[PDB]
Structure formats: C-alpha cells, structure tokens
Amino acid sequence: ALQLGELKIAYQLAVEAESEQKWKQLAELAISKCQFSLAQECLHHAQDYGGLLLLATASGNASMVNKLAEGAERDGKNNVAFMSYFLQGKLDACLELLIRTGRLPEAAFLARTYLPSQVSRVVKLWRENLSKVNQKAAESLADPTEYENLFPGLKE
Amino acid sequence: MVLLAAAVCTKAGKAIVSRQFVEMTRTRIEGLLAAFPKLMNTGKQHTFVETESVRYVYQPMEKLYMVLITTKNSNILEDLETLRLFSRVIPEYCRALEENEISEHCFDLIFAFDEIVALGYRENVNLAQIRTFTE
Amino acid sequence: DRATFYLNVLEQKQKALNAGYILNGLTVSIPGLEKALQQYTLEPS
Amino acid sequence: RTLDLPIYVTRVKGNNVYCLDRECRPRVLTIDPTEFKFKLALINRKYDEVLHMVRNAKLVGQSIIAYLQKKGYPEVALHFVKDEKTRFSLALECGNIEIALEAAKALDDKNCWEKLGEVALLQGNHQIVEMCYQRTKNFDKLSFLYLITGNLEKLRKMMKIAEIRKDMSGHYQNALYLGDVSERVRILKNCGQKSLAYLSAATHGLDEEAESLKETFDPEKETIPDIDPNAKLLQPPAPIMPLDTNWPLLTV
Amino acid sequence: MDSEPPSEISLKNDLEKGDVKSKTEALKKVIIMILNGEKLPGLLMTIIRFVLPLQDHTIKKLLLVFWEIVPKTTPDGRLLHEMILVCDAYRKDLQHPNEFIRGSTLRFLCKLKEAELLEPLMPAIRACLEHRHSYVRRNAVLAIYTIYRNFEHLIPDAPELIHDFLVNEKDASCKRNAFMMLIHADQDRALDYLSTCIDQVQTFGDILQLVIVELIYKVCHANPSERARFIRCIYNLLQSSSPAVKYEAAGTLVTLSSAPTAIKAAAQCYIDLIIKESDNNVKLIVLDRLVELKEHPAHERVLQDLVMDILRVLSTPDLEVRKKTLQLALDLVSSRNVEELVIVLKKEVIKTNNVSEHEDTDKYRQLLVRTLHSCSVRFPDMAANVIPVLMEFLSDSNEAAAADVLEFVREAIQRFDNLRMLIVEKMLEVFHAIKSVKIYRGALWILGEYCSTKEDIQSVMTEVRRSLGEIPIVESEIKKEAGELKPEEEITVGPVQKLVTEMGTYATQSALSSSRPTKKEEDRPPLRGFLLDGDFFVAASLATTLTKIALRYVALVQEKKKQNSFVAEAMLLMATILHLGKSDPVYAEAYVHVNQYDIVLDVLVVNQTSDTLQNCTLELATLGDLKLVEKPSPLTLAPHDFANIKANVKVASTENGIIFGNIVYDVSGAASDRNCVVLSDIHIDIMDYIQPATCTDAEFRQMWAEFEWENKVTVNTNMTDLNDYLQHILKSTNMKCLTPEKALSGYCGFMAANLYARSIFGEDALANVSIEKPVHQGPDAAVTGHIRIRAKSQGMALSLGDKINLSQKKTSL
C-alpha cells in the first residue's frame, strides 16, 4: 500500500489505534507526497510529539497542536510546548507550561510581556520558590528589594 | 601498538621471557602472565580467552603457555598467525617449551619477538630469517 | 485442596464453622509427655 | 596531637591531659590554643581573629579552607572561597550567580554554566542566563526563553546558531515568536522539510516563500491538514518595551 | 637465570671474559632480569665495550635487543648524547652488507620514540631501503611510520630518503609484498595506492591494507583477509531479524564454546529459530524469518517434523542440550507452550505403556502428573487429552504409582467441575493395594467428589479403610472430601449418606461405616476435623458444603503462572530454578577533606619539640585493602615545624603483608632504633576490607539454605525503614539493601531487606533487616529492628549486626 502510494489503504492496514511503526512509515510517505493531511493523522496515531509538532505548529491558529504537546508542558519538553500555544497572539497554555515544569521565572516573564498584569501573582509564587530553594541574598520575598521584581517594579 | 606484549610464560607464576616493544609493560608483563596462563589463560581449551579486560591467545606446551596478549584488535586471522609463526620459531631456539631451556635462550626468543611483532604490528618471521640475526 | 476448603469457609462462608473450629487453635492430638522415657533408654546405648 | 604509641588517658586534671598505657609508659599533652581558638572564634562570628588562628598545626583541608563554605546565607562561605568549587557553591547559596559563572568557568565546565544559568533565571534577569546557556550550547532553551523574556533581537541570534544543529525545537521556535514566520521557512528548507516550511510560511500569507519551497522540492500545497495551511499566523510580538533580560533587580 | 634480582656483580664479570659465548650469555642474563623487572645499570660500560662496531650479528642483535626495553634508564656506559652508545657505531650496523644486522639495527632504532636518538633513526631507514626480503620491506614501512610517530609529523619524516621516509607504504601496494603502516596520519597518495592494491594483493599485506580501508563493491576478490571483512559488509546489506542463517560467522563461532555440549545446545537454538517465526507467545519464541524452512506441508518429503521431534526430549541427547531442546520444542510449535508441552509431557509422565518413563520414586512421578495436568488448567483443549492419559498413569497399579496420579487429578477436578465425572471409576481401582498416604488421599478425594457419577463407594473405600499403609495426611484429605455431590446417588451397601457418616468419622468422629476408617486423628496440628464436621449442612450436596469447595478452585487458577499449575515440563524447570541470575617524636592532627571530588586525608605534622627530627620523611602505607593514592611528600617534621601535608586515600586494594589495623601513617626522622615511627591519623575500620556485592531473591534464598543465619540481635535506631540510616550504615560495612523477604498487609509489614556482600575475608555476608515498625496492636518492641545476620562462618555476621545502629565522625580544627 505504501509502494502503490495508496495512503488510504495503508492507513486502514495500520489501523487508527496503535501500530505506530506502520503509521510512522505512512506519515513520512504522506509528507513526501506533500499530502499534509494524511500525514497529520499518521503522526497523531504514531503519537511522535516532537515530529508531530513540527508539521502541526505551522498552523498560525494552533488548531491541532495543543494535544500533541499537552504532555510536553510538564515533561520538560517545554520547547515543544511553547511553540504550540504561542502562534496567533494567544497565551493558550504558554504560561502554564512554564509553571508546570518549575520554570516559574519564565511564567513571570511571559506575563510581563503581554501584560494583563498577571505578573504580580507569578512573581510571588516564584519569589517564594527562591526562598525555599536556598537563596537568602537574592531570597525574593519583597516587591523589588530581594532580587526579582513583582509587577509594580515591572511595566509594559 | 595493538599488541601490548608477546610473551612466553611458565605457569610457575611468572613470565619466563617476554617482550616489551616500547617501554610500557616491564613488571606489568610478569604479573599478567603469572596469574592468567596458570588457569590455562582462564581458557577451557579455547585459543581465545579474554580476562581482566586483556585478550590472551595462547597454546599450552607442557607447564608452559606461549601467549600473545592484545587489548585491541585489527583482524581475527592476524593475532593467531603471529602466534603461530612464533610457534615455528620457539622449538628452533628451545626444543619445545620448558622453563629452564626458555630461560637460557632469553636472547634468542626476545630478539624473535621484536622481529615478529614490531611496535605491536604483526610482522612475519621464519626460521632461516632468524639465523641472519643470531649469526 | 485443604486451602480451597479452609479459604472458602473463611472467605465465603459464615465462619460459624471457622469460629467453632478455633477453640484456641490447638493441636491435632494431646498425648502424654513422650520424650522423657525415650531419652532415658536412648542415651547409654 | 598524636603520640607514637597506643595509650589510655590517665585522666585530665589541669590543662594537661596525662596518659599511661598497659605497660604503663607516660605521655603528657598540654591542651593547646590551636584548634580550640580557631573554632571558639568562628562560633562568635569572627573571621578577622580566625585569619591569625590559621596555622599549619590545624589547617587541615576542611575546618579552615572548605569547612568555611558551609552557610546557606554565606558568612563562613565568604571568607573561604579559594577553591573553584567552594566559589561555585557560595554563589547558589546567596542566589547571586555572577560569582557562579566565574567559579563555573574555573571548574572548566559546561554543567555548572547551565545550572547557574537556571538559578540566574530564578533571581530574575535573563541577560546572565543567555550568556551561560549560549556557552553550554542551549540555544534552543534560549529560543524558548526568549519570547517569554520578550526579546526579539536576541531570539534571532539563537535561531541561526540552532539552525545548524537542526534542533527542531530550537531553530523552529523563533519564527512563531516573531509576528512573521520566515525564519522557519529557510531553516526547514536547509533541513529539506519542504512541506513543513510551506505550511508555516503560507499561513502567515508568505505564500510566495511557501511556493518557493514547493517549487524547489515536491509541489502540492493545495492539501488542507488537521492544522491550517493558509490561515493567518500573525502575532503581535512582545508589547513590553523593556524586556526581561532587563528584568529589574536590586539584590540583597 | 629465570629471575634472580641480585646477580649483577657476576654478570659484569661474565660480560667480558675473552670468550664470546660468555659475553652473549651475560648480556642475555641482563635481558631476562630486566624483562621481569630487576636491576641492570651497574653493568653498562662492560656491556657496551665488546660489541659496538662489529658486523658479528649475535652480540650486536643482543645489544640491539636491550635498546628498546630500558635504553633511557641505564646511563653508566651510555650517558646522554645525540649519537649515544646505542647508535654511533650502529651506523656501521645499519650500513653492513649483511641485511640482518642492518635490519635489526633499523628496526630497534626507529622503534623508539626517544628524542636522544631522533637524528640517528632518521637516515636509519637506509638499512632497509633495499629490500632483500618481505621482512625488509615490511620492516621499512613500519620503521618510517614509527619515525613519523616520533616527533616528525612534518617534513623530517614524510618524503623519501632515497626510496622511503614515509613512501614504503606507497611502494608496498605495487610491490610483490604488501604491508601498510599507514593506518593513520600518513600520505593520502598511499591510501589511494592501497585501494589499487586490493586487486594486486599479498595476503598478510591485505590485512594491513584492509584495517585502513574496508568495504568492497564486489563479492570478494580473494584471500582470508578480504573474506573476513566481507561477512561484516554482508550483515550491513541485510541486518533484518538477526543474520538468521549465519554467514561466515559460523567458522569462529564453534570454537567460542569448545567445552563441548554447549556448542550443540546453541546450534540447536539457531536451527529452531531459523525454522520459522511463529506467534511468539509464552515460550513460542522463534524469531528469524517466517519462511525459509517453512513449517508443515503435507507433500513435503521426509518432512520438517523429523528435526522437530529431536527437540522433544526426555534427555535424548545430553542434559545441556536437553534443557535447550525442551524449550525449543515449545518455541517452534505450540499454541503458547501448552500444546507441545502436553505432547511432550505425555511422553515424560508415568504410564503402563512404557516402563522407560515410569519410575517408583514418588515425587518425580507426581510432578510429572502435575505438569501434564497444568496444560489443561492453562488451555481447555488439554483437559480432554489429559484425563484419559491420567487414567493410563494410574494403570501402573503400584500403591505409589496410583497415588501420585490421584493427587494431581483431584486438583484438576477442583478446576474442572463435573467434567471429569468419567475418571472416578478408573481412579478407584488402584486404591486397594496400598502402602502409602498419597493413594488414600487422592482416591478418597476423586471417589468422594464424584459420588453422583458412581455408586460403588462403600465397596472401594472399605477395603482401604480397613487396610493399612501410612495414614497421617490421608485424614486431612478425606476429611474435607468423602461425602460430596448429590445427597443419595450411590449405594453398594453404603449410599452417599453412609459416606457423610464415614467422612465425619475419618475426620475426627467415630462411626461404624466402611468397616471403620483407617485412622481419625488428622494430619499437621492446625488442620483438625471440626470445620468439616460442622459442614455438610446439606448432606454431600452441591450447595454450600464440601461439594461446593470440591467443585470450586481456590482463588484464580489459569495459565502456567503456578496457580494449579506447574510451569512447563517438570524436568526442564529444575534447571531453570537452579539459575540464580546473580548480578623519634611526632605529632599528628587530621581531618578528611574533599575538594573537586578529590578525597584526601589531611594531616598536619607537628614537631612541638626543640630536638632534631631531621631525616624527616612522610609516608602513608598500604595495609591491606586500604591504599595510598600518593603519600604525603614534604620533607617536614623539622625543629618547631608545623606543616600541612596531604595524603590521598583509596579504600580498595589487595592485601599487603604489613598490619591490618586502622590506618597506618609513618613519619621518619632522626633516631637509629626507631628511625621509622607509626603514629595515627583519625579512624578507619576493618569493615572497609569487606567488598560489596549484591544478591537477588533467588541468591539470597539459596544462601539462606546453604548456611545458617539464625543469629540475630536487635539493633537500636532501626526504628526507621530500610532506605534511611540502615542503608547508609550498611553501605559503610560494604553491604547493600536489595530484594525483600516480606509478606506485608494490615497485620504484616515489617520491612524486609535481603543483604549481600562478598567480603575479602573468605566469607560472603548476608543479612535480613526486619524493621519492627508497628502494624499491629502488639508490636515486638515497637519501632526498632531485629537484624538476622550471617556470613559464611558468621565472622562478618556480627559486622552487619552492629553497623546498622549508628555511625558518624566529624572534627573542626
């Protein structure tokens, strides 16, 4: 079915639930023919979060890119995750990926960027995290005194 | 070097005669040969046996082991072939292996070792070739 | 076999039987004190 | 002090301690102001007293030159910092990693630069993180960080030096993060990922670049995937004028 | 002179004597003592003086020999110069008409990476530029390469001298004999030239071309060298599902297991794999290719199955090959393992058919019945096959032979409810000649459960009930059993009710019925009569009685997970169980410091005294398994010197003959009676010497059995679990907490660790740490743990016993 170039027949033969090895071979074949459509479905069934994202995050509306990177957020596959959510000026779960991983500073930083002034809460949670994670001279528990700066220090 | 040393052993617990191509395995030569060749190189009557991360190739002759040691390798046929040629050369010098007669012809055997394997790369030898040197 | 019985009576059944059965959980027989006489003859043989 | 024989202390009456063994040969020993003065001084937070106190009858390795790197709010730590490791340690315990990078440098090691860079992001400032992360070669982590940080100039630098690595979750990121996607289109072209390059480009309305990729490679751009292939991509990149590489700080 | 390190005075004498033989022998004796590693510089002037110019090869060859193994070290008769006494008159040696002396000289000279001989080795290529033998040309390419290696990576070694300076490697390719010392870093033109040479080869030489440049477009072109590379290249061009059918790999492979059965067993494995790639369920593992030897046409002559029959084994070839073979029958053909295991088991299990498969040892017979029977429990189809074969097992009609047979089949009935009704009548038959427990137990259970089906039972049971043999366990089994199934469906002179009467008497009551039972007093102390006595609510009838129990199976019973099963074929299993699968005053002060992961014992050496201690040396010693990684090296301990001296420490070594105490540290000084003193730095223990090793549950269990561990102590501060203090402390007495021996629940749940070590003490060390952490209203002693300990004569047992309490040291100088 791959040889014939019968994508559909190869697709039934894989069978939508699992047989990921079949689907990865099909997905590549689908990208070759530049039939992106069959490819997105093959990659989904394959799973292939890293690869699947690359085809998928080319959306500009993030239409089917969040799912295949939902995990990535909290798996420390943050990079895969950021591309998914930030793609049309939206913060879909951009911030959230950063909180999940423990890369709290980065959520604060993002919050400042697009300023809905969410920063005040993120900086706090983060600052608290510095005090627990042995910093005393950059301890952060202040509003601008102990290193980092909560939202009134910050600005648009 | 690929071939650390080419060594004739007695399983008395010592390297009877041995050759260090370039200064590396001096005293080291005796300890390896002394422990491992006693157990048949830890063999089971197999020409290749590897122990303590050193390849030992051998042939038993009496209470003695003629031993080739490598810890790296370029080809299968080659390691055996230098040992083999060595085994044509060794009874010409010592009438089989035997510690006292091996001991007496340290010079003979040692010279053959340098000639046979040069800087760890297995050259070839022959009993007539050996003659020009000890002449 | 014993287990299927014993288990089923504990697991499945009322344990009227199980309860009744344990009176302390005693041995299968109560003889005399056998060892001492045995020992008397056995030692200087 | 050590004697040259095994012994039993006879007892302590006075400064001396007196000893006798099984055979009963004596040893006496004056209680010194060596080890005793040094730590009597360190306990009462004196470092100035303690420098004199440092002698080679009591120096050891870790009671003077590395035991004094054992405060989570550095005090003792500040005083002995001579070892490139003790210096590294000192820095995370403050949370100011400016010293870390140098110790990390002098430890000649990448791992230290990425870990201090992470601590750096924690004190809040990403300039310091960039430098570290750049030399550990985590251009892709940086690429990810960078819109989060709100830089666009720095974000481009990462994209190129991650292009060459073919880090598809590094070079790939930045194009999304700026309002136009063109960065990806070329990187992907070099990857040979013509499909991916077209989809990305096309959606932003850079159909012309998308077409270039199709024409150089296998065409067919018409196909509509589970994602859009031509719907607007535009994002307003970072509304902040001062970025989070320029995250404010005072530091205590 | 095998190895005699003091003999150097005699060698000097022997080295010049006016007799050439003596001189040769002497120089030879020097060589043999150096090679072992012993004293040699005293001699040097004597050695060097006779031999130097001469074309007389033997002494020259001998001296030439001694210059590649120690030239640098020896300096009495040589000293340091550019044209040393290694090469000054060996320019003559290089330029003699006899090839041997020149050749030899060239060969050692260029071999050295010496910089005090760099110039003399360079035009030393002259000696072999003319090639009187294959040896001369090979000697030359290797010597130019060795010159290149010795600091001449540039223009001193690269072009030609008059024919070679790094160009023999080019020349060799087109010359009659090849050999390429060109493996790395050498002329591109020669590399290219070797490729051309693949065709015009010299076979030894081809192995040299080939280490450098491999992969051919051809099939070959000839010779072992090309051939050896070729199988590597073939595996590339078809990686897919192993090699399957081994290529030129086969030749070396046999020798790889010359000891002797293991080769066949291995060979059998590959041959089975190769046949087919099946489903690959539980023990159906055959990989390789699906069709390449098929299985099972009906027109194939004389068929595939003939080779398949070998693999079905009783031992039909020898035991190593047997274990491999049983797995291999299972692997090509079954459903999982079950199908081919039933066939295989039918052959193995005891019958009246063949007396080469029956034996009067009861356990093996029994086990074989259970193996056959487990296949049914696994898979249904097998139930139908098993029951008639089981009746054949019975037909042996020895007391014991019946007995084993009855015991499994009765379990099968618990699984297989009113399906095996048919068997009961067969099963009774051999129950009458009786000398054992087992027959009574089993028979009484079949005949008991099966009562609806038959009606014989007073008659069958009664001969046995008044017969003797061994009857302990008989009681237990008859007690739960005799009444069962349908309330009044038998009768011979005792209906099912007489049976319930009997069943009760046999359990522990008394009653005239079946001419009284053999015994009444039950088996092991816990079991007793009473449960069942209470029972039989509805007289032997499927309801909620004995019958229920009998026609039901305790927990899950499926597969070969050992739930009414036994896991393949009984003989193969013994081998698998066996497989453990084990994986002058002196003062010191000191502390241990770690900076940048360097572990060092800091020592400060103090002379509080005004007296002289000059002659001061500092040493850290190797005691046994403790070692110095570098002693403290300062010459300190002088009048009123305070010094910090660092002695690096290791924990792992090999036993030295000196004392085995704490740490020995030695300072030396002035004094002539006690020039060396031993004085101490802080504590290190005997425990270091133990070596950590680990066990799995099987190795632990085996060792438990192997040697006693009754010895126990209770150790305080084992309040905590295995992971915390106990692991850390156990680690320091080189032990490790591995697998469990626990049984946790709501009443159980002491933490159990299985420990192992293999001490360098001639013992292992094992222990179980049981942490008595309350999971009951009445704990042992509350929190604390009792460590049950051993070692192989329990001399390290004790170390485990106390080094799991506490352990800490610190100082702050």
DSSP string, E60-129: HHHHHHHTTTSTTT--SSS-S-TT-TTSSSSHHHHT-SSHHHHHHHHHHHHH---STTHHHHGGGGGGGS
Of B15, B72, B100, B27, give the one whose Cα is nearest residue E69. B27
| Chosen from A61, A96, A109, A133 to mutate, greatest number of chain D CBs within 10 A | A109
Resolution (A): 18.0
| C-beta of residue E580 within 8 angstroms of C-beta of residue E697 | no
| C-beta of residue B79 within 8 angstroms of C-beta of residue E211 | no
Catalogue the long-range contacts made by E628-633 (C-beta closer than 8 Å, 24 or more residues apart).
E632/E603, E632/E605
β partners of residue E667: E618, E677
Cβ-proximal residues to A109 (8 Å cutoff; 6+ apart), any chain: D124, D126, D148, D149, D150, D244, D247
Cβ-proximal residues to E58 (8 Å cutoff; 6+ apart), any chain: B107, B133, B134, B135, E24
| C-beta of residue B78 within 8 angstroms of C-beta of residue B89 | no
* Residue E365: its H or E element: helix E362-378
Phi, psi of A119 (to 5 degrees): -55, -35
State whether A32 and D214 contact (CB < 8 Å): no
Q: How far apart are CA D206 and CA D208, in angstroms?
A: 5
Give me the helix-helix angle, E399-415 and E437-449, nearest 10°. 40
Q: Which residue is associated with the tokens 């009760």?
A: E504
- Polymer length of chain E: 813
- Number of Cβ within a 10 Å radius of residue E357: 14
- Partner chains of E (3+ C-beta pairs under 8 Å): B, C, D
Virtual CA dihedral for A57, A60, A66, A68, nearest 10 degrees? -20
Q: How far does Cα E677 stand from its chain's mean position?
A: 46
Q: How far apart are CA E374 and CA E397, in angstroms?
A: 23
Longest pairwise C-alpha distance within chain C: 55
> Please, after which residues is chain E broken with C–N above 2.5 Å?
583
Q: Which one-letter DSSP state was computed for residue E606? A: E
Helices assigned H by DSSP within E528-569: 530-534, 546-550
Quote the tokens at residue E151.
Answer: 């600091």
Quote the tokens at residue D34.
Answer: 């060596």
Classify residue E681 as left (phi > 0), alpha (psi -120 to 50) or beta: beta
Quote the tokens at residue E638.
Answer: 């002088």
Classify residue E612 as left (phi > 0), alpha (psi -120 to 50) or beta: beta
Q: How far apart are CA E593 and CA E600, in angstroms?
A: 6
Q: How far apart are CA E288 and CA E276, in angstroms?
A: 7
Q: How far apart are CA E316 and CA E582, in angstroms?
A: 30
β partners of residue E791: E765
Catalogue the long-range contacts made by E188-196 (C-beta closer than 8 Å, 24 or more residues apart).
E193/E169
Strand order in the sheet with E598-606: E587-595, E598-606, E642-650, E627-630
Cβ-proximal residues to D71 (8 Å cutoff; 6+ apart), any chain: D77, D93
Q: How far apart are CA D144 and CA A82, in angstroms?
A: 7
Catalogue the long-range contacts made by A149-154 (C-beta closer than 8 Å, 24 or more residues apart).
A149/A123, A149/D124, A149/D247, A149/D248, A149/D249, A149/D250, A150/A119, A150/A120, A150/A123, A150/A124, A151/A112, A151/A117, A151/A119, A151/A120, A151/A123, A152/A120, A153/D248, A154/A112, A154/A119, A154/A123, A154/D248
Give me the numbers of helices (H) and strands (E) for chain C, helices first please.
3, 0
Quote the tokens at residue E462.
Answer: 């009664």
* E527 interface with C at CB cutoff 8 Å: yes
Distance from CA of D146 to the nearest CA of A (A): 9
Classify residue D150 as left (phi > 0), alpha (psi -120 to 50) or beta: left
| C-beta of residue E411 within 8 angstroms of C-beta of residue E375 | no
Virtual CA dihedral for E100, E101, E104, E105, nearest 10 degrees? -150
Q: How far apart are CA E707 and CA E792, in angstroms?
A: 7
Q: How far apart are CA E716 and CA E786, in angstroms?
A: 8
Of E207, E147, E146, give the one whose Cα is nearest residue E172. E207
| C-beta of residue E421 within 8 angstroms of C-beta of residue E390 | no
- The three-class DSSP label of residue E642 is strand
Quote the tokens at residue E790.
Answer: 């051993």
Of B89, B78, B77, give the one whose Cα is nearest residue B19. B89
- The three-class DSSP label of residue E641 is coil
- Polymer length of chain D: 252
**Could you check whether the bond before residue E211 is cis, i.e. omega within 30 degrees of 0?**
no
Amino acid type, E591: Y
Name the experimental technique.
cryo-EM
Q: How far apart are CA E54 and CA E806, in angstroms?
A: 76
Q: How far apart are CA E142 and CA E149, in angstroms?
A: 10
Quote the tokens at residue E427.
Answer: 């099963």
- Per-residue burial over C2-24, b if 16 or more Cβ lie within 10 Å, else e, is bebbbebbeeebeeebbeebeee
The dihedral built from the CA positions of residue E457, E458, E463 and E468, taken in this order, carries a sign that is: positive
| C-beta of residue E532 within 8 angstroms of C-beta of residue E480 | yes
A-D contacts at Cβ under 8 angstroms: 235
* E524 interface with C at CB cutoff 8 Å: yes
* Residue B10: its H or E element: strand B5-10
Q: How far does Cα E67 stand from its chain's mean position?
A: 44
Amino acid type, B72: K
Class of residue D13 by CB neighbours under 10 A (exposed 0-12, middle 13-18, buried 19+): exposed
State whether A61 and D232 contact (CB < 8 Å): yes
CA distances from A63 to A40, A86, D184 (A): 12, 12, 19
State whether A55 and D195 contact (CB < 8 Å): yes
Q: Which residue is associated with the tokens 């910090």?
A: E644
β partners of residue B50: B55
Q: Which residue is associated with the tokens 């593992």?
A: E285
Quote the tokens at residue D158.
Answer: 């990462």
Q: How far apart are CA E310 and CA C44, in angstroms?
A: 60
Which of B19, B111, B119 is facing E142, going by the closest CB pair? B119
β partners of residue E381: none
CA distances from B111 to B95, B100, E517 (A): 17, 18, 93
Q: Half-sphere exposure (CA, 13 Å, Cβ side) for A6?
A: 7
Q: How far apart are CA E33 and CA E10, in angstroms?
A: 13
Class of residue D251 by CB neighbours under 10 A (exposed 0-12, middle 13-18, buried 19+): middle
- Per-residue burial over E700-721, b if 16 or more Cβ lie within 10 Å, else e, is beebbeeeebebbeebebbebb
Q: How far apart are CA E532 and CA E517, in angstroms?
A: 16
Q: How far does Cα A22 stand from its chain's mean position?
A: 26
Strand order in the sheet with E676-679: E617-620, E665-668, E676-679
State whether B77 and E207 contact (CB < 8 Å): yes
Q: How far apart are CA A151 and CA E73, in angstroms?
A: 74
CA distances from B6 to B73, B93, E143 (A): 14, 16, 19
Q: What's the alpha-carbon Rg for chain D, to the nearest Å?
A: 31
Quote the tokens at residue E82.
Answer: 């550019």
- Per-residue burial over E324-335, b if 16 or more Cβ lie within 10 Å, else e, is bbbbbbbbbbbb
Which of D150, D214, D252 is facing A139, going by the closest CB pair? D252
Longest pairwise C-alpha distance within chain B: 40
Of E14, E44, E16, E46, give the one whose Cα is nearest residue E29. E14
Q: How far apart are CA E509 and CA E483, in angstroms?
A: 14
Cβ-proximal residues to B68 (8 Å cutoff; 6+ apart), any chain: B3, B6, B7, B56, B57, B58, B79, B82, B83, B86
Least CA distance to C27: which residue of chain E?
A: E525
Q: Half-sphere exposure (CA, 13 Å, Cβ side) for E602?
A: 25
State whether C4 and E550 contact (CB < 8 Å): yes
> Please, after which residues is chain B broken with C–N above 2.5 Å?
none
Cβ-proximal residues to E770 (8 Å cutoff; 6+ apart), any chain: E750, E751, E752, E785, E786, E787, E788
Least CA distance to B103: which residue of chain E?
A: E2
Amino acid type, E813: L
Phi, psi of E407 (to 5 degrees): -60, -50
| C-beta of residue E155 within 8 angstroms of C-beta of residue E177 | no
- Per-residue burial over E35-58, b if 16 or more Cβ lie within 10 Å, else e, is bbbbebebbbebbbebbeebeebb
Quote the tokens at residue E326.
Answer: 């049983």
Write out residues 180-239 of E within 8 Å (CB-CB) of B: 181, 204, 207-208, 210-211, 224-225, 228
Amino acid type, E792: K
Of E72, E81, E133, E79, give the one whose Cα is nearest residue E106. E133
- The three-class DSSP label of residue A113 is helix
Virtual CA dihedral for D13, D15, D16, D18, nearest 10 degrees? 30
Q: What's the alpha-carbon Rg for chain A, to the nearest Å?
A: 21
Q: How far does Cα E578 stand from its chain's mean position?
A: 13
| C-beta of residue E310 within 8 angstroms of C-beta of residue E344 | no
